[PDB]
Design an enzyme around this catalytic site. Sequence first.
Site, PDB file in Angstrom:
ATOM      1  N   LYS A  15       0.680   3.328  -2.778  1.00  0.00           N
ATOM      2  CA  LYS A  15      -0.436   4.460  -3.201  1.00  0.00           C
ATOM      3  C   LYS A  15      -0.146   5.780  -2.753  1.00  0.00           C
ATOM      4  O   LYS A  15      -0.177   6.806  -3.555  1.00  0.00           O
ATOM      5  CB  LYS A  15      -1.396   4.224  -1.652  1.00  0.00           C
ATOM      6  CG  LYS A  15      -2.494   2.868  -2.209  1.00  0.00           C
ATOM      7  CD  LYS A  15      -4.006   2.486  -0.789  1.00  0.00           C
ATOM      8  CE  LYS A  15      -4.058   1.589  -1.274  1.00  0.00           C
ATOM      9  NZ  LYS A  15      -3.219  -0.357  -1.005  1.00  0.00           N
ATOM     10  N   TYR A  39     -11.827   2.597   2.894  1.00  0.00           N
ATOM     11  CA  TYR A  39      -9.651   2.386   2.310  1.00  0.00           C
ATOM     12  C   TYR A  39     -10.683   0.757   1.316  1.00  0.00           C
ATOM     13  O   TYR A  39     -10.695   0.371   1.289  1.00  0.00           O
ATOM     14  CB  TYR A  39      -9.286   1.885   3.519  1.00  0.00           C
ATOM     15  CG  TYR A  39      -8.081   1.467   3.736  1.00  0.00           C
ATOM     16  CD1 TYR A  39      -7.036   2.810   2.538  1.00  0.00           C
ATOM     17  CD2 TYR A  39      -6.660   0.692   3.539  1.00  0.00           C
ATOM     18  CE1 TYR A  39      -5.412   2.536   1.909  1.00  0.00           C
ATOM     19  CE2 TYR A  39      -5.396  -0.214   2.843  1.00  0.00           C
ATOM     20  CZ  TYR A  39      -4.834   1.148   2.085  1.00  0.00           C
ATOM     21  OH  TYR A  39      -3.965   1.363   1.678  1.00  0.00           O
ATOM     22  N   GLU A  85      -1.628   9.308   5.508  1.00  0.00           N
ATOM     23  CA  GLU A  85      -1.856   9.659   6.376  1.00  0.00           C
ATOM     24  C   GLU A  85      -1.252  10.951   6.900  1.00  0.00           C
ATOM     25  O   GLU A  85       0.059  10.539   7.253  1.00  0.00           O
ATOM     26  CB  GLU A  85      -2.615   8.734   7.332  1.00  0.00           C
ATOM     27  CG  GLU A  85      -3.381   7.377   6.971  1.00  0.00           C
ATOM     28  CD  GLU A  85      -2.885   6.150   7.426  1.00  0.00           C
ATOM     29  OE1 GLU A  85      -3.132   6.267   8.670  1.00  0.00           O
ATOM     30  OE2 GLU A  85      -3.502   5.104   6.755  1.00  0.00           O
ATOM     31  N   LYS A 138       2.261   6.281   6.224  1.00  0.00           N
ATOM     32  CA  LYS A 138       1.514   5.170   5.753  1.00  0.00           C
ATOM     33  C   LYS A 138       1.902   3.534   5.576  1.00  0.00           C
ATOM     34  O   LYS A 138       3.527   3.514   6.060  1.00  0.00           O
ATOM     35  CB  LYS A 138       1.396   5.649   4.123  1.00  0.00           C
ATOM     36  CG  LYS A 138       0.585   4.393   3.401  1.00  0.00           C
ATOM     37  CD  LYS A 138      -0.679   4.964   3.726  1.00  0.00           C
ATOM     38  CE  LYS A 138      -1.492   3.549   2.517  1.00  0.00           C
ATOM     39  NZ  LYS A 138      -1.625   2.853   3.662  1.00  0.00           N
ATOM     40  N   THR A 139       1.512   2.488   6.062  1.00  0.00           N
ATOM     41  CA  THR A 139       1.909   1.454   6.592  1.00  0.00           C
ATOM     42  C   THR A 139       1.377   0.773   5.038  1.00  0.00           C
ATOM     43  O   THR A 139       1.390   1.663   4.144  1.00  0.00           O
ATOM     44  CB  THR A 139       0.823   0.752   6.877  1.00  0.00           C
ATOM     45  OG1 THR A 139      -0.007   0.612   7.048  1.00  0.00           O
ATOM     46  CG2 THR A 139       1.016   1.123   8.551  1.00  0.00           C
ATOM     47  N   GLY A 140       2.467  -0.638   4.944  1.00  0.00           N
ATOM     48  CA  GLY A 140       2.331  -1.378   3.043  1.00  0.00           C
ATOM     49  C   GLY A 140       1.933  -3.079   4.263  1.00  0.00           C
ATOM     50  O   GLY A 140       2.987  -2.990   4.349  1.00  0.00           O
ATOM     51  N   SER A 141       1.625  -4.114   3.590  1.00  0.00           N
ATOM     52  CA  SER A 141       1.854  -5.621   3.155  1.00  0.00           C
ATOM     53  C   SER A 141       1.458  -5.930   1.995  1.00  0.00           C
ATOM     54  O   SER A 141       0.383  -5.752   1.333  1.00  0.00           O
ATOM     55  CB  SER A 141       0.800  -5.616   4.298  1.00  0.00           C
ATOM     56  OG  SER A 141       1.020  -4.824   5.361  1.00  0.00           O
ATOM     57  N   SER A 167       0.384  -1.206   0.260  1.00  0.00           N
ATOM     58  CA  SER A 167      -0.020  -0.175   0.412  1.00  0.00           C
ATOM     59  C   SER A 167       0.707   1.390  -0.160  1.00  0.00           C
ATOM     60  O   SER A 167       0.258   2.207  -0.343  1.00  0.00           O
ATOM     61  CB  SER A 167      -0.982   0.181   1.171  1.00  0.00           C
ATOM     62  OG  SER A 167      -1.996  -0.956   0.545  1.00  0.00           O
TER      63      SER A 167
HETATM   64  B1  LIG Z   1      -2.487  -1.902   1.746  1.00  0.00           B
HETATM   65  O1  LIG Z   1      -1.066  -2.975   1.285  1.00  0.00           O
HETATM   66  C1  LIG Z   1      -3.595  -3.014   1.609  1.00  0.00           C
HETATM   67  N1  LIG Z   1      -3.417  -4.180   1.392  1.00  0.00           N
HETATM   68  C2  LIG Z   1      -3.116  -5.126   2.632  1.00  0.00           C
HETATM   69  C3  LIG Z   1      -3.719  -6.283   1.754  1.00  0.00           C
HETATM   70  C4  LIG Z   1      -2.825  -7.920   2.326  1.00  0.00           C
HETATM   71  C5  LIG Z   1      -2.281  -8.347   3.351  1.00  0.00           C
HETATM   72  S1  LIG Z   1      -1.813  -9.447   3.256  1.00  0.00           S
HETATM   73  C6  LIG Z   1      -2.976  -9.588   1.755  1.00  0.00           C
HETATM   74  C7  LIG Z   1      -3.639  -8.729   1.629  1.00  0.00           C
HETATM   75  N2  LIG Z   1      -4.295  -6.049   0.554  1.00  0.00           N
HETATM   76  N3  LIG Z   1      -3.830  -4.515   0.107  1.00  0.00           N
HETATM   77  O2  LIG Z   1      -1.404  -1.781   3.145  1.00  0.00           O
HETATM   78  P1  LIG Z   1      -2.457  -1.734   4.423  1.00  0.00           P
HETATM   79  O3  LIG Z   1      -3.160  -0.448   4.074  1.00  0.00           O
HETATM   80  O4  LIG Z   1      -3.681  -2.291   4.477  1.00  0.00           O
HETATM   81  O5  LIG Z   1      -1.446  -1.088   5.770  1.00  0.00           O
END
Ligand SMILES: *[B@]([O])([C]N1[C]=C(C2=[C]S[C]=[C]2)N=N1)OP([O])([O])=O
Length: 354
Positions: free
Chosen positions: A63, A146, A268, A308-311, A60
């Site tokens: 983004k 979101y 954010e 911002k976080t990302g996963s 994420s």
């Molecule tokens: B973004 O990367 C939104 N996000 C998480 C995921 C996911 C994690 S495990 C399987 C799918 N898909 N989209 O991250 P966030 O804002 O949640 O940190």
Amino acid sequence: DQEIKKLVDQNFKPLLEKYDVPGMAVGVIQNNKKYEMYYGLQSVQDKKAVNSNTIFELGSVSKLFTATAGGYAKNKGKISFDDTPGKYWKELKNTPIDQVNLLQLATYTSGNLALQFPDEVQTDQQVLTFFKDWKPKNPIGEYRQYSNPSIGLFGKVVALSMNKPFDQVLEKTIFPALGLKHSYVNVPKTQMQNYAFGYNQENQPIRVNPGPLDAPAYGVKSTLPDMLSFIHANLNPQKYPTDIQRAINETHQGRYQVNTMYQALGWEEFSYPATLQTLLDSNSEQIVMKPNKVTAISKEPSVKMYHKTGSTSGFGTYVVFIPKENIGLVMLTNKRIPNEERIKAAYVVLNAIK
Ligand SMILES: *[B@]([O])([C]N1[C]=C(C2=[C]S[C]=[C]2)N=N1)OP([O])([O])=O
């Protein structure tokens, strides 16, 4: 100054043993000086060390690049944020989704878009049909949920407005303008040996699967040095070309609030100094997973910070910067750890410096 390595070792290093994380890169930028800390392995099976060449999935945090591309297109007059997607994606003209403006797509307030597309949606044709058959639920602009498809469509419209596919917008225009040398939508053959494996909750090696509008939503890969350059650009936009400077400043403007969280473009935004629980609450189940009625910004913060976080299935990311302190932090891991642990470790490090 010798402080910074010791603080990262104290607050980030223990998370590797605690969550069995093979590899981590933590960067700090302070007064235009970069600090890179590397731990463990990019690949467990190859016994290959995390280093400045290691490529991680940003999830994420992608983004933020989509938001920057939108800000670049707007300030070049290619789009307005008051426009609707039908003006660019002709096959969406006069459909219900054509009542939602580009800002509302970018900031997740269509009033009826979930976190993911349905699993069944894969092809370009299935994506188009999904948006053609879309109907409102909540009043448009009033509810934040979101959503990957929401900012995904915003990204696709930005690409159409610049007459290039989205991958080329980032790789040929935005990454070069930011001075990023190893940031990719598609990692090329020559760099595949630098692409880390991600590891799932069973510590099995995994990489992100292709998906509908993946690139603008969660599809960027980058190195620690590139992400520190990106934080540098956000802290010091004056040093960059006019076009990308305006783009970056566009991403810093809060659009609405959900209590103590202000939604900017991708980023954010918070009043600085922010309490730890304010930063934790920003990524609570309530904010991330469920619809929340937005308010207009009432208190417009004088002094701001951004995160911002990302996963992905195999990778965790966290980026935070504070313009007033000229300081920022990047965390990249090739296994997910709870958002709480990422935010808390960054909070202690950044509050102990200065
Ligand atoms: B973004 O990367 C939104 N996000 C998480 C995921 C996911 C994690 S495990 C399987 C799918 N898909 N989209 O991250 P966030 O804002 O949640 O940190």
